[PDB]
């Protein structure tokens, strides 16, 4: 049985891992009612969208949001892992980050007070992570000029 | 797709110092280093030095080492992938043995293990 | 420094092969060896670019070789402009070329 | 020789999964041409979108065709299928939803009546491709927690 | 150290290539800023977008980013690249196209005189790119009819 929309983000680490589909899917079931304007189609054709800024402006939100979703994908894009939803890297987990043990991480956190624990350090794994794939660019760099 | 043009040619007698102008078009300027290569009457061609137009860096020979000025003019633009420039030559104490026809060249790629290689040779110019 | 081979011909058609060495301080291998064809006082042209491979526009016939200890040009299907004076260098990256004594002859075959 | 967009749309399922592709492009060329914005970029500034809301109502409709290739790029991000047109997964074929046989199915049949045929079941087969991820999310899970 | 955003425009082909990742982020890092609208929140509400056509202009800017990264994305996904920045593909080089070596491309010249020099033959390169896949396609085909 699964919690439901965000259900497990009171839970330990590992097991809003397994549900991660379930928080994924909240970013495409909100905007497949949108842009289906099924029930839109005929309601006053199309909301009536003149002299109606209201209806530019829940336009621009709905734009937002899926132009957060492309942000998303592009940093997954970026570091080799779009189709996955779990991927490992090659970037070495520096401890002054975290000094916490995996079994007190995974199985004694929440992934809420972890992102606040890292938010500090964030841009800097960022930025391992944009340059440590720059590394497989230079071993496909290294298969280029033969 | 690139020229080189030499100067005039000219003879003094040996003890003055001169100068060769060695004038580009066709390519980029700052892109391929520039060679200055002599060939002897008598004996075998020697390569003299290069110098880069951009980057400045000079490297000659042992043999003329501590007796060779190199300079490079800015490059002027032309096309978007295309400039011109000029390189100068120059040498302090002139002698009989200096005598043979000199030539300037340029760069065939610009990165790798072949980057200062001559490539493209200028027509040439005579001596005392 | 590095000593040219003797300067072989051959008639026109079939194959001739100069050789280039030197030293152990500039042998062939562990340096860059460069060929050049160079009409007596005139503009050179460059031939092979590196001691496998090629310049933009030699054609096929000019093929290379070089071993651990000296260097080697083949020109297959010799025609009348070849005969010229060939030089070779050695270089490296941070170097300077180092020319060859030369191979001034050649000849055509039925003249 | 390439019958066209949607050309294979009346031949067996096995001759338009072989030009998948050609279906695949009218959802970037028709779009490649609005964003272009090059011979609109000129004609009266930006085809004076002042006191013109159809030309904002031209732009909600080009924001729909985009918003609905985010769809299917989510449900094949989401079934680990992203970077591939075709991709074979681990869900078992459960025989009530359809019980024809395998030449029947793509010798005999067409994309059209086989979607129409499965329209029924077509939620439960994504629950189960939504969830059979989720078994693989666990098994990197069996990863994470060493 | 990084030459910065498109900072390798002037260097030889490889060295661009080493650092693609810094030119794919001003696709991100320039949308990123405007989707955020932290700073839009509440200067003026949503910028006055009563009466200032201006403001749905602006909007309209901001989709065609988004838009033409949609772009890019699709052909990374119709060639079957759609992770990684450097892929290799079945599809042989023909030589009408230039005649150029391997040295003197990656050593000797820019991505921007190389575009330019293949812009006559990109769509036919594009649509060996589509077919070959579809022999990939077949290959599948193969493996689905048994
Ligand atoms: C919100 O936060 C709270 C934190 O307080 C969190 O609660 C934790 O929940 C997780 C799971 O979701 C627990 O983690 C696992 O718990 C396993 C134990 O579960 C069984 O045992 C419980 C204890 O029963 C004892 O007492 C009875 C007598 O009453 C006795 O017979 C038993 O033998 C045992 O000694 C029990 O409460 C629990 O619940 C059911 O059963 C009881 C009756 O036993 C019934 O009264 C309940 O109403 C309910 O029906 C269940 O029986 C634990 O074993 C496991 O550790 C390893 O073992 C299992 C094998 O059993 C492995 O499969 C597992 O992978 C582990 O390797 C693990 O610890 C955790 O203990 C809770 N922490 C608490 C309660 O403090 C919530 O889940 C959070 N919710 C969200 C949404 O985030
Ligand atoms: C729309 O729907 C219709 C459905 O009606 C569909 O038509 C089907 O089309 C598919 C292919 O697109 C056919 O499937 C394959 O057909 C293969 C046969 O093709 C050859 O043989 C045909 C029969 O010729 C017989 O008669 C002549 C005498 O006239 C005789 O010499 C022959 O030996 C043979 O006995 C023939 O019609 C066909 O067409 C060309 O040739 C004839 C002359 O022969 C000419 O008159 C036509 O104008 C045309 O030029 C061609 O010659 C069949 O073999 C194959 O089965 C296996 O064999 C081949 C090896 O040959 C394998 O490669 C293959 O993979 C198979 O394993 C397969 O059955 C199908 O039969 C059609 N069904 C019909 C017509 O009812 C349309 O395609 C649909 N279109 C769209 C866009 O959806
Ligand atoms: C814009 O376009 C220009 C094109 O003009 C381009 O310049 C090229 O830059 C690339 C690299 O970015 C160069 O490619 C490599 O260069 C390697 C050489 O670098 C060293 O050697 C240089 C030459 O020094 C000679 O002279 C000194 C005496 O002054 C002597 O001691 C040396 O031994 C040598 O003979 C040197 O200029 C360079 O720069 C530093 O050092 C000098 C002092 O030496 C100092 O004065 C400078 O200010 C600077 O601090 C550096 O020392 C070359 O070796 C390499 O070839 C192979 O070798 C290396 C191993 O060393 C391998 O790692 C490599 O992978 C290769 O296999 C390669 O050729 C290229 O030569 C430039 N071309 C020029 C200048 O014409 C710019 O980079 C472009 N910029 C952009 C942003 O696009
Ligand atoms: C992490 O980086 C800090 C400096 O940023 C350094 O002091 C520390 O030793 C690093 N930890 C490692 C490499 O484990
Ligand atoms: C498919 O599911 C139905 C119930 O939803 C079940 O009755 C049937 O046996 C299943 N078929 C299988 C498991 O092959
Ligand atoms: C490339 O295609 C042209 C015709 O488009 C052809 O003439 C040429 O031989 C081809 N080159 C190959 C196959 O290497």
């Known amino acids: 049985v699964f919690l439901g929309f965000l259900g497990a983000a009171g839970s330990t680490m590992g097991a809003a891992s397994m549900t991660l589909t379930v928080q994924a899917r909240n970013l495409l079931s909100g905007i497949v009612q949108q842009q289906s304007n099924l029930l839109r189609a005929p309601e006053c054709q199309q909301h009536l969208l003149k002299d109606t800024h209201w209806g530019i402006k829940q336009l621009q939100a709905r734009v937002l949001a899926v132009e957060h979703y492309l942000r998303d994908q592009q940093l997954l894009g970026i570091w080799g892992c779009s189709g996955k939803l779990i991927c490992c890297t090659n970037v070495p987990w520096n401890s002054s980050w975290s000094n916490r043990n995996l079994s007190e991480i995974w199985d004694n956190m929440t992934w809420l007070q972890w992102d606040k624990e890292i938010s500090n350090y964030t841009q800097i794994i960022y930025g391992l992570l944009e340059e440590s794939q720059n590394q497989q660019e230079k071993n496909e760099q290294d298969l280029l000029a033969l | 797709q690139g020229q080189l043009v030499q100067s005039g040619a000219t003879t003094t007698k040996p003890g003055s110092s001169v100068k060769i102008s060695c004038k580009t078009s066709g390519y980029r300027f700052n892109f391929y280093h520039i060679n200055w290569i002599r060939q002897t009457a008598g004996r075998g061609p020697e390569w003299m030095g290069w110098?880069?137009?951009?980057?400045?860096?000079?490297?000659?020979?042992?043999?003329?080492?501590?007796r060779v000025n190199m300079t490079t003019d800015t490059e002027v633009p032309v096309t978007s992938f295309t400039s011109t420039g000029a390189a100068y030559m120059e040498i302090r104490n002139l002698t009989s043995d200096d005598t043979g026809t000199y030539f300037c060249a340029k760069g065939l790629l610009r990165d790798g293990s072949s980057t200062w290689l001559p490539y493209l040779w200028g027509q040439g110019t005579l001596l005392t | 420094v590095l000593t040219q081979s003797a300067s072989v011909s051959g008639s026109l058609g079939q194959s001739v092969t100069i050789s280039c060495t030197g030293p152990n301080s500039v042998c062939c291998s562990h340096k860059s060896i460069s060929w050049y064809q160079w009409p007596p006082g005139r503009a050179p042209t460059l031939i092979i670019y590196e001691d496998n491979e090629r310049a933009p526009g030699i054609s096929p016939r000019f093929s290379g070789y070089k071993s651990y200890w000296s260097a080697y040009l083949t020109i297959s299907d010799l025609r009348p402009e070849d005969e010229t004076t060939y030089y070779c260098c050695s270089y490296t990256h941070n170097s300077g070329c180092v020319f060859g004594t030369g191979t001034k002859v050649s000849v055509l075959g039925q003249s | 020789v390439f019958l066209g967009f949607l050309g294979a749309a009346g031949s067996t399922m096995g001759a338009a999964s072989m030009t998948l592709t050609v279906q695949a492009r009218n959802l970037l060329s028709g779009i490649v041409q609005q964003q272009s914005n090059l011979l609109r970029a000129p004609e009266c500034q930006q085809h004076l979108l002042k006191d013109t809301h159809w030309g904002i109502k031209q732009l909600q409709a080009r924001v729909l065709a985009v918003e609905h290739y985010l769809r299917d790029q989510q449900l094949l991000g989401i079934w680990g299928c992203s970077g591939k047109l075709i991709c074979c997964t681990n869900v078992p074929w459960n025989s009530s939803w359809s019980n024809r046989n395998l030449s029947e199915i793509w010798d005999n049949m067409t994309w059209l009546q086989w979607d129409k045929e499965i329209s029924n079941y077509t939620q439960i087969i994504y629950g189960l491709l939504e969830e059979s991820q989720n078994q693989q999310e666990k098994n990197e899970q069996d990863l994470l927690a060493l | 150290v990084f030459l910065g955003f498109l900072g390798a425009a002037g260097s030889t082909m490889g060295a661009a290539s080493m650092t693609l990742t810094v030119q794919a982020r001003n696709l991100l890092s320039g949308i990123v800023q405007q989707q955020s609208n932290l700073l839009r929140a509440p200067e003026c509400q949503q910028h006055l977008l009563k009466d200032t056509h201006w403001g749905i202009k602006q909007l309209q800017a901001r989709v065609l980013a988004v838009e033409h990264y949609l772009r890019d994305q699709q052909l990374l996904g119709i060639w079957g690249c759609s992770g990684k920045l450097i892929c290799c593909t079945n599809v042989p080089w023909n030589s009408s196209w230039s005649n150029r070596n391997l040295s003197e491309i990656w050593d000797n010249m820019t991505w921007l005189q190389w575009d330019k020099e293949i812009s006559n033959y990109t769509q036919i390169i594009y649509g060996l790119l589509e077919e070959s896949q579809n022999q990939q396609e077949k290959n599948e085909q193969d493996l689905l009819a048994l």
């Open positions: 110098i880069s137009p951009y980057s400045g860096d000079k490297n000659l020979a042992p043999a003329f080492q501590d």
